[PDB]
A paper describes a structure:
Like other coronaviruses, [name]-[name]-2 utilizes the receptor-binding domain ([name]) of envelope homotrimeric spike (S) glycoprotein to interact with cellular receptor angiotensin-converting enzyme-21–7. Neutralizing antibodies (nAbs) that effectively block [name]-ACE2 interaction represent potential prophylactic and therapeutic options and could also guide vaccine design. Crystal structural comparison of these antibodies reveals they share similar angle of approach to [name], overlap in buried surface and binding residues on [name], and have substantial spatial clash with receptor angiotensin-converting enzyme-2 (ACE2) in binding to [name].
To reveal the structural basis for potent neutralization of the public antibodies, we determined crystal structures of [name]-[name] (2.40 Å), P5A-3C8 (2.36 Å), and P5A-1D2 (2.60 Å) complexed with [name]-[name]-2 [name]. In the shared HCDR2-[name] interface, interactions are largely mediated through HCDR2 residues Y52, S53, G54, S56 and Y58 and [name] residues T415, G416, K417, D420, Y421, K458 and N460. Y505A appears to have more profound impact on [name]-[name] than the rest three antibodies. To explore the potential emergence of [name]-[name]-2 resistant strains to public antibodies, we selected escape mutants by growing a replication-competent recombinant VSV-[name]-[name]-2 in the presence of [name]-[name] or P5A-3C8. The mutant viruses emerged quickly during 4 days culture in Passage 1 (P1), at the concentration of  6, 250-fold and 2, 500-fold higher in IC50 for [name]-[name] and P5A-3C8, respectively. Sequence analysis of the resistant strains from the highest antibody concentration identified K417N and K417T mutations in [name]-[name]-treated wells and K417T mutation in P5A-3C8-treated wells, all of which were present in 20 out of the 20 clones analyzed.
Residue numbers in the entry:
A (entry chain L): 1 to 212
B (entry chain H): 1 to 131, 138 to 217
C (entry chain E): 333 to 516, 521 to 526
Amino acid sequence: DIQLTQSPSFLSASVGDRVTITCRASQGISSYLAWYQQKPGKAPKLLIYAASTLQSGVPSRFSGSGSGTEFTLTISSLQPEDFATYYCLHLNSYRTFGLGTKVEIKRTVAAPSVFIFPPSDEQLKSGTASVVCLLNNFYPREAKVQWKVDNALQSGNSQESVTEQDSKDSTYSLSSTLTLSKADYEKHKVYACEVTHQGLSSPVTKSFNRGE
Amino acid sequence: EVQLVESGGGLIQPGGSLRLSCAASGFTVSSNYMSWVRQAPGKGLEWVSVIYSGGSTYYADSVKGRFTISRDNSKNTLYLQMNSLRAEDTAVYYCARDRDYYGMDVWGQGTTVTVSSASTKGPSVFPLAPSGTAALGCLVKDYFPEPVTVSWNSGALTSGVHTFPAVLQSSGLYSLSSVVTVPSSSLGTQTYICNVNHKPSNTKVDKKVEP
Amino acid sequence: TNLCPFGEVFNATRFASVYAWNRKRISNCVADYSVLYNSASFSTFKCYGVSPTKLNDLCFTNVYADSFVIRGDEVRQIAPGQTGKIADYNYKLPDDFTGCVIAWNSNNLDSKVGGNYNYLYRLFRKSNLKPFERDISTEIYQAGSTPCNGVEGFNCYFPLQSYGFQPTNGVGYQPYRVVVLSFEPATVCG
Ligand SMILES: *[C@@H]1O[C@H](CO)[C@@H](O)[C@H](O)[C@H]1NC(C)=O
């Protein structure tokens, strides 16, 4: 049991840059390592095997290098079609992939615009309340939604998802849903989501009072 | 030409069993190392199993005792027999030709396996009602299985639309949101309808979204 | 009265690649195996036919000493009933093996800064070896339906690969030297 750790999980860069992705083995594994590329909705592709050997037909800007404990994959001058996720893999009577590195398009910081949506009367009739918080067109990816209910910080009753980088402005959007039974939803007044983000000087809170 | 095509994926209940097939061209399956690799929704690649040209087989711990890799030389086809399936076995399954030290150079397009107790169900669509940029949308809640398609004004409204990845709730049903931002000046003058289509249940919903 | 030359197999300065594993035939001599077993310099000393401290008390028609180098994680494959690239394609012990498997880390001798590429093992083969089969072929391996005609390419692979032994390898990837003693009108006794 040799553990592979790939870093970073997310890397932002621009066309023409030199990007470096690292895979670290808990023990020296010589050249028993390969690198793969995967674009969304598509099958993996082999890039490099035996640590530094470039697979045939793979552009020469891709190169790999490894000592035994530290392996890096280097894209010498990033091309638009190189935005993708990259996985290192280790092998011998098994195959083990690393967690992966997503290479994303760099751009300037952009604060989200924040909206909160109360549950529709129609859904309430059915006995559940969904409160939704939208964070629209922000960059970078990292953002914190904190649901507050009558100023009690909520935990364990929310799920969120995030879009892929937008094809025209390279921003993300995020949607977080807070789910309550109707009875619980009726036993509280102020519903808020508080958003922390690098493009905001202070956290921004959008809220509403139940039934106003 | 060189090709791998994987079929056999579909919906199955926890505890059930399913056999995947991978039909190859341009190389000899029984002459090669052959792998299955999978990818759960929104997660990384996980190696599953390998067969050596001489017939030895190996398995990831997470499927050991439940999966069996095999092949049929006369059909140049590779198989993965999956028993005692679990919800977390839900993934796209790929086969690859495996060159060992030299890596996996030829991949299939993948086949989808879905393991779930849930039974087919169309979504409820609830408005995400708005309060120079306004936001509105539709909450597409409690459907199964994936996917749904969402459009706005029958395709006429595309700018500013974000349709978010579905989440899988603890109920076993899926929920998704689709939103658009518009000039707030148009909230009183433009009709905004979201068109929700869930073919597995043959369900179509248009829902007008207003203040 | 004469001593079996176990020293010149265990202490040989150079060891074979596993795919071309060496075989030494011990005949017409006396052997003290409890001196091997009392060496306490071997990380592996597993005997499969009969007790190791109880084998200085037996006779055999012929004793074979096979020796080679493999990586550490592969030493477990040198046992009856195992599978893997070594057991399947390089050196295969029978299911009814009677004998002893001895191994020790040889990182000090068989790895080099920069990497020692002299030790090779068979990577591609259509079918598994029979017990005690030695395949020294270097023909190009045909992984598809077109014959290779001695040219590496798509579906045409050189069948051997080299372990890159470096001293900074983890011990599972470091070189181990292995000696396999198999026990076959007596010629060798204790
Ligand atoms: C190998 O050499 C050492 C040093 O002389 C010796 O003690 C040992 O007995 C030798 N090994 C064998 C198997 O004779």
